[PDB]
Design a binder for these strands. Structure first.
Length: 49
RNA sequence: UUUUUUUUUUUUUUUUUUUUGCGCCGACC
């Protein structure tokens, strides 16, 4: 509106890198999202070539 | 013409059968 002084660029960018791995985080409970972000760093895969 | 020292015997071989501690960081239940 006219009263607004700034516009948000990306509301999904307020999360960290591990927290962005969770798909649809707004449909989950906050402790579940915290657990998912925590366990995202404990997974196994091709980390480095 | 002159005194105040004492005396005796009993103990054996060439030598022998496994890192503790200190502190930090991350993480699980």
């Amino acid at each position: 509106t006219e009263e607004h002084t700034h516009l948000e660029l990306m509301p999904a960018a307020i999360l960290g890198i591990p927290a962005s791995l969770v798909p649809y985080p707004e449909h989950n409970a906050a402790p579940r999202n915290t657990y998912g972000a925590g366990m995202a760093k404990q997974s196994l895969g091709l980390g480095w070539a």
